[PDB]
Design a protein around this nucleic acid. Structure first.
Lengths: 43, 75, 141, 69, 851
RNA sequence: CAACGAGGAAUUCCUAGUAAGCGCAAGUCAUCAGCUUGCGUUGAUUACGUCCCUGCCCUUUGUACACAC
């Protein structure tokens, strides 16, 4: 078993293990996680 | 510090001590033979004798005493 | 949010479990575990592990899924082990086995616990340089 | 010291629907960042010549002389 | 170059903002665009136009639109005006000397409310980005930033230091503890947006999208989580649109309270709230017919405690309001509407009857405006100015005073001109009508009904003025002469297409007409000769201009570019792309080939006709610039726009290892300082209590970052990286190793941050003593010996404590899996079928190998 | 009654058969004899570390399969 992505859609699950919920993330971390996902797509 | 004219005293490794020893002795013999009656062999003999007994009349150990004294100063 | 601010980790835990806010759940479990190490059969405070003892099947299957993907770290694994331990010692083992879905989780997190057991056991193994240094320091006279 | 490319990007950020400002800025950075069409000596106590321009006028002069002959 | 600048701006009285009222009825501070103007309601003369000290158009004016004022707010007693603008900045002025005292940028979008609090020295500001910031005025500092809303702050209400309560452009109302600056209680007020908020101390009132107005009871001294603010019932209004400002008063002389809800459209609903005596004596009357049903009826309160009142209407759409009161028969309410006009109404009320079928306005300040956008501007020789509107408000302003001295009523009028002697105005309207006015006498010299079959679009005089040209959307142009002061239609040229601009040359030579069919045609006036057809603009084509030498024409259009044409052969010269929306108008200078073009994207632009540069990019308007007009001689140019504005333009580094070393030295210095303090306390409590140490004050950086020294050292030990950790621990000498051991010895007494950093403490400590083992076992001190023993016991106890539950969980989880297996795995006794079953049911993973 | 007794400020290059000294031949379709290219003879001093300065470059999911981090 390895930590993939979330089986929901209001959730963000990093491969670290730290599952974050989109309703609980503030807008700063929403923008930051969106840019980080853009980096991991762009590579 | 970008060129702040301050010196800091370091120690010096034994290979550098032997390198700078041979350099000080030989170029002291050269400048001591530069335009005097004596040749390089006789000036080097005088230099090696005075450096062996440590007489402070040699270029080499006067230069050593200056380097060590400046290190003692801005230690 | 008010419970997470003012303290009060048990009702914060059950609200984070009801809302399914997993980072907040990790924070309430980590904070309550750390204050449990601070103060002084019971591993969290008693109100919170009773609140873990009284949750139903789908709640404990999402709790053990959270414990599953926290156990893949070597950092966030202690919180997962304390939560797994209180589930194991506060629930019925026949119930835990016959819940549909509780073998694709516990088979996922047996080998990670074995990996951590090997690592912490080697930490205890190389913790005896202190004992060797003490026997040298006593031989010093 | 620092690169000609780094100084060129700095010069473009310096200079930044007008046209003649861009004509002036482009001609300025071209004749500044082209160093191989001047000649520089070393002052022993400095642009000392313009080789390509002197060459082209010296050869256009004899070109029109040759066509005249 | 002799550049341009802005002399004065006018034409606006009330713009896209609120209004504050000041007592002497009284005066009124309101917004013009980017500057605030004060008016006395009594007469209405402009007694102040407080503006920025820099003229827009100067050398240091920056290359964007100026910040439109969006919220006025006033501190009455200490005489301040806090005004806030559309970029987010807040300027606080003293109204005595009219200078800027405070600049308070802070925000990221336009701001929506201000409020002074504790009457002086504190200002709270809410903006179109969802933050709400508290500012001190004695420190010039944003104190706090309350940050949990989602869309845009629509209102708030604060009391001093403890409770704020805001409501935003999502559906949410929030209550804020201003001591901790964390939001305490959040509700969904209305299902769409939430536009209103007012409160008289017991009841709170909010409104949302459509007529549903919600009463709330805030109980500030509550202790439950949900229940500091509860909802007590809804009611209805007569307007189905956004009620967007609610405000309360307590009239004296008995004690009574009134609140209004202004609406989007045209209407303010006023309400009297009643008093507790008629609450008590009205409860029984709806509690008649005598109790579960009666309790449901008594619960279903709003119409009970609130009483509607005289619903004040207006002619136009309502933008802001505020009132004053005496006697409860002088509810005197000032009102700024959208089409620029303020109105001072006042409703009387004899404490039972409102004494009127409809309220009455006592004043109206509307003379210096237009109520619509000025579709055509014009100028005299140099003295007067002509503004043409849609309601009919032709106005003849003057340049030297900026006051309309003469105004008439025409209709939907889009183009106009003067007459060459002055004191006479020709004009065409959007239906088939033309009109003539003057300056000394009354409005109408004559109108010409059926001047055209359809919408007129552009007219032009000849340079002597006796003959004018009218081109209209009935696909015709017509010529008119002046017979003696009446209009003589004599000839008419019908085209194939809707002509929408005309012009003649300034020397009676050419007639250039711009058709809807993407082209212009140049005719000879003396022959109707069809000289030229200029083509290739590619959208329908607006304003033309002919130069003074009658050699060079300009051609503007909705293609966002103006074309320069040489009129001798009809050859194009430039096609320069300006103005990213649409160039509405373009005009030469008097004597030069320089020209101006004003456009539909709130900018006028100054060009030359020789190098075709842009000389200047003037940036003072806020919206679509509909017209501009140049002086006949001298060359100052006026421009008039959609924001009801008319404005003049005239001429002028350690690393890891040493970071850990300095952290270790200050941390262990603080630690043994406190331990010496504790030994002093025990000795001065176990001996003759006559003396002790005075005080060890804690470290500057430790109280600055709010950390115990173990935490400070622990996070810098965390912040070094794993690649240079074995170097950071190898650089430090043995004295720092000994105080590192003191740090570890103290940190495994606080068992919270021991267990959260166990493998880091183990890795660092074991590398440290493994590297320094030769010197450590040669140190002779029983203090360090007891230290090593104590660290050993606590560290190994923590590690065996975590692997105890690790081993417990291994055996328990494999018991759970194994009892599930022996419950319902399968039935194979034969070993070959068993092993093939397990091979088919195993976990597969596919790997990329190399052969 | 002119220059000059190892050449100022600055500046460039250089790590083992290398720097430098020394002579002897050739003259190879371009180049070179106001010299160029070969060939041997003699043959060191000091770095061989470091990113502290000056710069240039690379990466910022570990992916590639375990173990470990």
């Amino acid at each position: 078993y390895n930590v993939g992505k979330a089986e929901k859609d209001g959730e963000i699950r990093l491969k670290n293990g730290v599952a974050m919920s989109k309703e609980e993330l503030t807008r700063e971390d929403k923008n930051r996680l969106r840019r980080a996902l853009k980096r991991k797509r762009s590579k | 510090g970008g060129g702040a004219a301050r010196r800091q005293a370091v120690d010096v490794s034994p290979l550098r001590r032997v390198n700078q020893a041979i350099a000080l002795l030989t170029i002291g013999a050269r400048e001591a033979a530069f335009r005097n009656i004596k040749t390089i062999a006789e000036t080097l003999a005088e230099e090696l004798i005075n450096a062996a007994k440590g007489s402070s009349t040699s270029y080499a150990i006067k230069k050593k005493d200056e380097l060590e004294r400046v290190a003692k100063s801005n230690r | 949010q008010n419970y997470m601010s003012k303290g009060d980790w048990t009702n914060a835990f059950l609200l984070a479990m009801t809302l399914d806010h997993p980072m907040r759940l990790f924070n309430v479990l980590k904070r309550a575990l750390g204050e449990s190490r601070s103060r002084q059969e019971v591993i969290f405070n008693e109100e919170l592990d009773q609140a873990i003892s009284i949750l139903n099947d789908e709640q404990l299957i999402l709790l053990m899924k959270r414990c599953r993907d926290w156990n893949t770290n070597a950092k966030t694994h202690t919180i997962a082990q304390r939560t797994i331990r209180c589930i194991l010692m506060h629930h019925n083992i026949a119930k835990l086995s016959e819940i549909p879905g509780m073998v694709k989780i516990v088979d996922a997190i047996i080998p990670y616990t074995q990996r951590h057991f090997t690592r912490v056991d080697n930490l205890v193994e190389q913790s005896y340089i202190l004992d060797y240094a003490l026997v040298e320091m006593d031989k010093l006279f | 010291a620092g690169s000609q490319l780094k100084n060129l990007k700095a010069a473009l950020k310096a200079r930044g629907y007008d046209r003649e400002e861009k004509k002036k800025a482009i001609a300025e950075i071209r004749e500044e960042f082209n160093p191989f069409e001047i000649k520089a000596a070393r002052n022993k106590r400095i642009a000392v010549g313009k080789p390509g321009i002197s060459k082209q006028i010296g050869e256009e002069q004899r070109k029109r002389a040759f066509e005249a002959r | 170059y002799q550049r341009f600048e802005q002399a004065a701006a006018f034409g606006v009285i009330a713009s896209n903002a609120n209004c504050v009222w000041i007592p002497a009825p009284g005066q009124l501070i309101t917004s013009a665009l980017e500057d605030v103007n004060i008016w006395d309601i009594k007469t209405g003369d402009l007694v102040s136009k407080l503006s920025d000290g820099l003229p827009p158009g100067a050398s240091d004016a920056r290359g964007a639109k100026p910040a439109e004022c969006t919220y006025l707010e006033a501190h009455k007693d200490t005489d301040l005006l806090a005004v806030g603008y559309a970029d987010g900045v807040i300027k606080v002025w003293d109204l005595m000397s009219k200078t800027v005292l405070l600049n308070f940028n802070g925000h990221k979008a336009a701001i929506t409310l201000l409020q002074f609090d504790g009457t002086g020295t504190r200002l709270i500001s809410g903006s179109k980005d969802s933050n709400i910031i508290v500012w001190d005025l004695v420190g010039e500092v944003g104190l706090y930033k309350l940050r949990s809303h989602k869309d845009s702050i629509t209102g708030f209400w604060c009391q001093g230091e403890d409770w704020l309560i805001s409501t935003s452009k999502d559906g949410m109302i929030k209550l804020w503890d201003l001591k901790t600056h964390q939001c305490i209680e959040t509700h969904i007020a209305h299902t769409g947006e939430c536009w209103g908020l007012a409160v008289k101390d017991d009841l709170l009132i909010t409104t949302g999208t459509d007529s549903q107005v919600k009463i709330w009871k805030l109980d500030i001294e509550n202790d439950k989580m949900g229940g500091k603010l509860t909802e007590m019932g809804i009611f209805e209004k007569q307007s189905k649109q956004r009620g967007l400002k609610i405000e309360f008063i307590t009239n004296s002389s008995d004690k009574t309270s009134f609140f209004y809800i202004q609406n989007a459209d045209k209407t303010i609903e006023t309400f009297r709230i009643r008093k507790e005596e008629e609450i008590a004596r009205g409860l029984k009357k709806r509690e008649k017919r005598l109790l579960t049903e009666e309790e449901i009826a008594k619960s279903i309160y709003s119409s009970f405690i609130l009483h509607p009142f005289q619903t004040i209407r207006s002619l136009y759409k309502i933008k802001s309001a505020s009132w004053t009161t005496v006697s409860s028969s002088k509810l005197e309410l000032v009102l700024t509407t959208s089409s620029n006009t303020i109105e001072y109404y006042s409703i009387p009320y004899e404490k039972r009857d409102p004494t009127s079928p409809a309220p009455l306005k006592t004043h109206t300040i509307e003379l210096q405006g237009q109520r619509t956008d000025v579709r055509s501007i014009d100028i005299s020789d140099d003295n007067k100015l002509l503004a043409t509107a849609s309601n009919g408000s032709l106005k003849i302003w003057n340049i030297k005073t900026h006051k309309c001295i003469r105004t008439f009523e025409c209709g939907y009028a889009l183009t106009c001109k003067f007459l060459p002697g002055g004191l006479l105005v020709i004009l065409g309207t959007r239906n088939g009508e033309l009109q003539l006015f003057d300056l000394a006498s009354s409005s109408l010299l004559d109108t010409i009904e059926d001047a055209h079959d359809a919408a007129i679009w552009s007219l032009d005089l000849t340079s002597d003025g006796k003959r004018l040209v009218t081109g209209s959307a009935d696909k015709t142009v017509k010529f008119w002469d002046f017979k003696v002061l009446k209009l003589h239609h004599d000839t008419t040229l019908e085209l194939t297409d809707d002509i929408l601009c005309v012009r003649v040359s300034p020397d009676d030579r050419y007639l250039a007409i711009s058709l809807l069919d993407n082209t212009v045609k140049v005719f000879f006036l003396d022959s109707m000769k069809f000289y030229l057809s200029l083509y290739g603009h590619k959208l329908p084509v607006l304003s033309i201009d002919i130069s003074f030498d009658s050699k060079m024409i300009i051609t503007s259009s909705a293609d966002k570019n103006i074309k320069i044409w040489g009129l001798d052969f009809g050859d194009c010269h430039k096609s320069l792309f300006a103005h990213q929306d649409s160039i509405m108008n373009v005009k030469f200078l008097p004597q030069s080939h320089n020209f101006f073009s004003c456009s539909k994207d709130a900018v006028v632009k100054y060009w030359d006709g020789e190098k075709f540069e842009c000389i200047q990019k003037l940036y003072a308007h806020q919206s679509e610039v509909w017209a501009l007009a140049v002086a006949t001689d001298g060359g100052f140019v006026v421009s008039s726009s959609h924001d009801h504005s008319i404005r003049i333009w005239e001429e002028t580094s350690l690393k890891a290892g040493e970071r850990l070393m300095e952290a270790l030295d200050l941390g262990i210095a603080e630690i043994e300082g406190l331990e010496a303090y504790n030994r002093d306390m025990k000795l001065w409590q176990r001996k003759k209590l006559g003396e002790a140490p005075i005080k060890p004050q804690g470290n500057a950086v430790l109280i600055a970052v709010n950390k115990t020294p173990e935490q400070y050292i622990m996070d810098t030990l965390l912040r070094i990286r794993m690649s240079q950790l074995e170097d950071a621990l190898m650089v430090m000498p043995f004295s720092y190793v000994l105080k590192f051991l003191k740090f570890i010895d103290t940190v495994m007494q606080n068992k919270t941050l021991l267990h959260s950093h166990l493998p880091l403490i183990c890795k660092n400590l074991f590398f440290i003593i493994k590297f320094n083992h030769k010197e450590l076992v040669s140190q002779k001190n029983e203090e360090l010996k007891l230290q090593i023993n104590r660290v050993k016991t606590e560290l190994r106890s923590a590690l065996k404590s975590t692997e105890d539950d690790l081993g417990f969980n291994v055996q328990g989880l494999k018991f759970v899996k194994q009892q599930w297996n022996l419950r319902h795995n399968y039935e194979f006794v034969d070993e070959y079928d068993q092993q093939e079953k397990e091979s088919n049911s195993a976990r597969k993973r596919v790997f990329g190998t190399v052969i």
